[PDB]
Design an enzyme around this catalytic site. Structure first.
Site, PDB file in Angstrom:
ATOM      1  N   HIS A  87       0.805  -1.222   0.000  1.00  0.00           N
ATOM      2  CA  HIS A  87       0.000   0.000   0.000  1.00  0.00           C
ATOM      3  C   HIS A  87       0.834   1.266   0.000  1.00  0.00           C
ATOM      4  O   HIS A  87       0.337   2.387   0.238  1.00  0.00           O
ATOM      5  CB  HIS A  87      -0.942   0.013   1.206  1.00  0.00           C
ATOM      6  N   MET A  92       0.354   4.676   2.400  1.00  0.00           N
ATOM      7  CA  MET A  92       0.466   4.020   3.685  1.00  0.00           C
ATOM      8  C   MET A  92       1.929   3.955   4.091  1.00  0.00           C
ATOM      9  O   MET A  92       2.652   2.960   3.907  1.00  0.00           O
ATOM     10  CB  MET A  92      -0.202   2.649   3.656  1.00  0.00           C
TER      11      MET A  92
END
Ligand SMILES: [Cu+2]
Length: 99
Positions: A87, A92
């Site tokens: 991610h 992220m």
């Protein structure tokens, strides 16, 4: 310090993503939403001489279950950048400072 992997609204984020700790203070990264996740320290953005393998999941390792954790305590002072490998481009990522 507890860090959620995935926010409570499903966002692909560490919560919190920027924080400071002292040496030996536990970080518990906990699967929350949007898993699998992992937590990988960027070997080029951690403190001098630190072995990323002592403190990181590999990029191939995953936490697969809601509530599964990865615990690590950092010791060397300085800034540590980290990310969730699947991610990362979604945003992220995070940074912990050991002071
Ligand atoms: Cu993730």
């Amino acid at each position: 310090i507890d860090v959620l992997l995935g926010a409570d609204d499903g966002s692909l984020a560490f919560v919190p993503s920027e924080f400071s700790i002292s040496p030996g203070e536990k970080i518990v990264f906990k699967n929350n939403a949007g898993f699998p996740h992992n937590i990988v320290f960027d070997e080029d953005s951690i403190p001098s001489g630190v072995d990323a393998s002592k403190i990181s999941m590999s990029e191939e390792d995953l936490l697969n279950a809601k509530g599964e954790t990865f615990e690590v305590a950092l010791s060397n002072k300085g800034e540590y950048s980290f990310y969730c490998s699947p991610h990362q481009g979604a945003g992220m990522v995070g940074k912990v400072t050991v002071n």
